[PDB]
Amino acid sequence: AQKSVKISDDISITQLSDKVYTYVSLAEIEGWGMVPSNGMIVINNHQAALLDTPINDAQTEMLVNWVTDSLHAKVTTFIPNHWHGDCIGGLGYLQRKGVQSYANQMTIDLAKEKGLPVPEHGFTDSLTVSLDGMPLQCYYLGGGHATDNIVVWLPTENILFGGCMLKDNQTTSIGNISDADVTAWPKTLDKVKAKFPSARYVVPGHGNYGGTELIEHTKQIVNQYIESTS
Ligand SMILES: CCCCc1nc2ccc(O)cc2c(=O)n1Cc1ccc(-c2ccccc2-c2nnn[nH]2)cc1
Ligand SMILES: [Zn+2]
Ligand SMILES: [Zn+2]
């Protein structure tokens, strides 16, 4: 069991640790109706790192003030998982609040071509940003749900922000695969299960959070759809 607090009505936080909370932001992502989105809020010493924002700026600006008022951290760092509304959907807000963003370089080149706000720090494989001594370990383990998708590993917290390459234990859906690397994903999770075999929490990019079975579960999903289309 773990605390489920509502900031708005359509915005929930769930605290998995002393320095890490996770929320789901339901918003309307155009073309699919009402989708529930995930994100990590990570607090070290009044400094707040945010791992993906909601669909627009309003909820970015909903979650960002709550994390002021109640956690008395200033959001100063951000990391989108890929370039989807569900990742940087609300980065327009946050660069304006001068937040410093880090992401996959691929995702940087991408957003640019589609003309979205652009993160300012890139990497090609791994990049360990410090929230004041708190390593916040981002990696590019390969493409999946999308080509630029990455994972963030909180080394002190054994918390793995799996992202949209992962699905919950509850869903058996490949969801939205327009910018995917299907033949390729299957082997990303494989790498991901190998690197954080010891992750206590492994949260997806949608769906409820879990353990490391979320990995073997998503893989299946993917093989069931590859094996069922190819
Ligand atoms: C109507 C669409 C399906 C809704 C849904 N609802 C859920 C409810 C509970 C839950 O635990 C999981 C889901 C879920 O995965 N989904 C699937 C879902 C699938 C894709 C999307 C979506 C929409 C726009 C851009 C990217 C995505 C995306 N799809 N997969 N990962 N990310 C959004 C939601
Ligand atoms: Zn996505
Ligand atoms: Zn997504």
Short mmCIF file of C-alpha atoms in Angstrom, two decimals, residues 70-183:
data_model
loop_
_atom_site.label_atom_id
_atom_site.label_comp_id
_atom_site.label_asym_id
_atom_site.label_seq_id
_atom_site.Cartn_x
_atom_site.Cartn_y
_atom_site.Cartn_z
CA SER A 70 3.94 21.07 -0.17
CA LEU A 71 7.49 19.74 -0.82
CA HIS A 72 9.28 23.10 -0.75
CA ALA A 73 11.55 22.05 -3.52
CA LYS A 74 12.13 24.17 -6.60
CA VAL A 75 11.80 22.27 -9.90
CA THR A 76 15.23 22.83 -11.55
CA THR A 77 15.94 19.82 -13.74
CA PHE A 78 13.82 17.86 -16.23
CA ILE A 79 14.07 14.81 -18.38
CA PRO A 80 11.52 13.76 -20.99
CA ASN A 81 11.42 10.05 -21.92
CA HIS A 82 10.87 10.63 -25.65
CA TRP A 83 9.32 13.51 -27.60
CA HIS A 84 5.61 12.79 -26.99
CA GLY A 85 3.03 15.21 -25.64
CA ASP A 86 3.14 12.87 -22.63
CA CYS A 87 6.86 13.59 -22.14
CA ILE A 88 7.63 17.24 -23.07
CA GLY A 89 3.99 18.14 -23.62
CA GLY A 90 4.48 20.79 -21.01
CA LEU A 91 8.11 21.86 -21.55
CA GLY A 92 6.96 25.19 -23.02
CA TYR A 93 6.07 26.20 -19.45
CA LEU A 94 9.25 24.99 -17.75
CA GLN A 95 11.94 26.66 -19.89
CA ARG A 96 10.07 29.85 -19.17
CA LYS A 97 10.45 29.05 -15.49
CA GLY A 98 14.03 28.65 -16.62
CA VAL A 99 14.12 24.88 -15.91
CA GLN A 100 17.22 23.02 -17.08
CA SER A 101 16.40 20.11 -19.37
CA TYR A 102 18.47 17.03 -20.28
CA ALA A 103 17.31 14.30 -22.69
CA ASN A 104 18.44 11.86 -25.44
CA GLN A 105 20.24 13.72 -28.19
CA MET A 106 17.96 11.89 -30.64
CA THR A 107 14.97 13.31 -28.86
CA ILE A 108 16.61 16.74 -29.24
CA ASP A 109 17.03 16.39 -32.95
CA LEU A 110 13.57 15.06 -33.14
CA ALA A 111 11.66 17.72 -31.28
CA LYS A 112 13.57 20.24 -33.45
CA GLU A 113 12.27 18.70 -36.69
CA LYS A 114 8.69 18.68 -35.42
CA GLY A 115 9.28 22.08 -33.86
CA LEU A 116 8.70 21.53 -30.12
CA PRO A 117 10.55 23.30 -27.25
CA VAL A 118 14.11 21.88 -27.11
CA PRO A 119 16.02 20.43 -24.15
CA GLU A 120 19.48 21.97 -23.85
CA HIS A 121 21.71 19.13 -22.80
CA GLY A 122 22.25 16.01 -24.82
CA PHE A 123 23.85 12.63 -24.57
CA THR A 124 24.27 9.70 -26.90
CA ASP A 125 24.25 6.77 -24.52
CA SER A 126 24.43 7.50 -20.82
CA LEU A 127 24.24 10.72 -18.77
CA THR A 128 24.27 10.97 -14.94
CA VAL A 129 22.90 14.37 -13.81
CA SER A 130 23.20 15.29 -10.12
CA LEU A 131 20.35 16.64 -8.10
CA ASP A 132 22.88 17.83 -5.48
CA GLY A 133 24.61 14.51 -4.92
CA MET A 134 21.66 12.41 -5.93
CA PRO A 135 22.77 10.63 -9.10
CA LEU A 136 19.83 10.59 -11.57
CA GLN A 137 21.04 8.09 -14.14
CA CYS A 138 19.54 8.42 -17.59
CA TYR A 139 20.37 5.86 -20.33
CA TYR A 140 19.65 5.08 -23.91
CA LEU A 141 19.26 1.36 -24.00
CA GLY A 142 17.67 1.27 -27.45
CA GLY A 143 14.43 2.21 -29.21
CA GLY A 144 11.03 0.69 -28.46
CA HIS A 145 7.64 2.40 -28.09
CA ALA A 146 9.60 5.04 -29.88
CA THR A 147 13.10 5.39 -31.18
CA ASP A 148 14.33 7.91 -28.63
CA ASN A 149 12.82 6.37 -25.52
CA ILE A 150 15.12 6.04 -22.57
CA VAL A 151 15.05 5.01 -18.95
CA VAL A 152 16.11 6.93 -15.81
CA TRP A 153 17.54 4.90 -12.90
CA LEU A 154 17.63 6.41 -9.34
CA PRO A 155 20.66 4.51 -7.96
CA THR A 156 20.04 5.43 -4.33
CA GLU A 157 16.36 4.54 -4.68
CA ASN A 158 16.44 1.34 -6.76
CA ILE A 159 13.57 3.02 -8.57
CA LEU A 160 13.55 2.60 -12.34
CA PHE A 161 11.65 4.94 -14.54
CA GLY A 162 10.95 2.39 -17.24
CA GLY A 163 8.88 4.83 -19.34
CA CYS A 164 6.67 4.08 -22.36
CA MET A 165 8.81 1.18 -23.50
CA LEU A 166 7.12 -0.58 -20.60
CA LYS A 167 3.47 -1.41 -19.92
CA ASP A 168 1.71 -2.34 -16.66
CA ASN A 169 1.00 -5.88 -15.60
CA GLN A 170 -2.65 -4.93 -16.17
CA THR A 171 -2.64 -4.14 -19.88
CA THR A 172 -1.97 -6.47 -22.82
CA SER A 173 -1.99 -3.66 -25.39
CA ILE A 174 0.85 -2.32 -27.55
CA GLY A 175 -0.93 1.02 -27.37
CA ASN A 176 0.31 3.64 -29.89
CA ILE A 177 3.10 2.51 -32.12
CA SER A 178 3.45 5.14 -34.81
CA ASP A 179 7.06 6.06 -33.92
CA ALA A 180 8.10 2.69 -32.76
CA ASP A 181 10.92 0.29 -33.20
CA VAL A 182 9.08 -2.96 -32.71
CA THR A 183 11.53 -5.45 -34.18
#
